[PDB]
């Protein structure tokens, strides 16, 4: 949301749910943000991670986990 | 408003069911909506039947049971306390009490 020349007007940007790509509003208290930690060789290790967020619209279906598998198959660390 | 989704008659894809007369009232109700208790029972109670086991001819005898199918009117049932009446939540259950 720009105007005239630069200056991103408005306050903040709503997070976009990974599973549906649909924006999470202010008062969705059923929203989630997972952190999943990486590992080095013979790890061990955390602190570097893949963040991922999903809305309460997706969760109350029961389709949270099936989509969250897809979002960490493409990263590498599952093999479904 | 609909007090029952069913309507209490339990009829689907007919347009016309069979009819039965109530065993007490007299009333023509539909067979589906009748409310029926098939009362099997032996003839001489339980306490009184030992007289027949004492008195009788033959070494043992099975006292043969009386088989009747009662059919009721709703109004005859609720008066006679076969069904009485239930809450809005507990209405929906269709199982057997006294299996």
């Amino acid at each position: 949301m720009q105007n005239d020349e630069g200056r991103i007007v408005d306050l903040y940007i709503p997070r976009k749910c990974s599973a549906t790509g649909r924006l999470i509003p202010a008062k969705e208290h059923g929203a989630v943000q997972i952190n999943v930690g990486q590992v080095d060789e013979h790890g061990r290790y955390t602190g570097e991670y893949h963040a991922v967020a999903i809305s309460g619209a997706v969760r109350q279906r029961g389709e949270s986990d099936a989509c969250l598998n897809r979002l960490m198959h493409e990263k590498g660390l599952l093999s479904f | 408003p609909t007090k029952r989704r069913n309507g209490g008659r339990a009829k689907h894809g007919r347009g016309h069911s069979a009819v039965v007369r109530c065993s007490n009232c007299g009333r023509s109700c539909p067979k589906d909506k009748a409310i029926k208790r098939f009362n099997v029972r032996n003839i001489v109670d339980a306490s009184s039947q030992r007289d027949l086991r004492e008195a009788s001819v033959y070494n043992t005898y099975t006292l043969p049971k009386l088989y009747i199918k009662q059919c009721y009117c709703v109004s005859c049932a609720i008066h006679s306390r076969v069904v009485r009446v239930r809450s809005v939540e507990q209405r929906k259950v269709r199982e057997n009490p006294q299996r």
Binding site: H29, T46, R59, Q60, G62, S64, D65 | -
Partner: protein, 198 residues
Amino acid sequence: QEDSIAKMLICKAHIGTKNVEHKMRPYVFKSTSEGIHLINLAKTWEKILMAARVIVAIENPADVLVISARPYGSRAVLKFSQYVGAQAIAGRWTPGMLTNQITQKFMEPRLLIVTDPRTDAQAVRESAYANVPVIALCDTDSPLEHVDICIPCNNKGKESIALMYWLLAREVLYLRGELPSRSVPWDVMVDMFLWRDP
């Protein structure tokens, strides 16, 4: 590696119920005669490797909960609270933990873990008021609604619950760096996680 999959046979963790949910169906395979369904034991252990990496990457481990209504969880969960330094509840949950600030058992966790989402559904309902991601040990019966990250096992067997909470604690510890090498299996036995009759 192979040995966790070998131990899952001794658990009877591959066994589940007659009825199977639509969501839980992918894990189950080759339903047996008698109408009992079997779980892919690769797909169980791959999701403990998932679920360990979620629990690690939390700074304070006390912000994790572990919950169980059923009494087979009670000795299991209270040993889990030692090694991963987490809060723990057993028995009756008392709703308005996560809502209701005034109540003196007001806990505001980041992550939440459950045995069965069927038996303590009231915990899993309350997670959706406070932005708390769940983890669950699912059976083929149990629902996935407000459940992130299933770990599909036998829930009802008293052996089988322990031998998940053994593998998580062990899995979490290696990630944590608590265990220096993977030549040793572990110091502590399985049988600290169990349940006894008296």
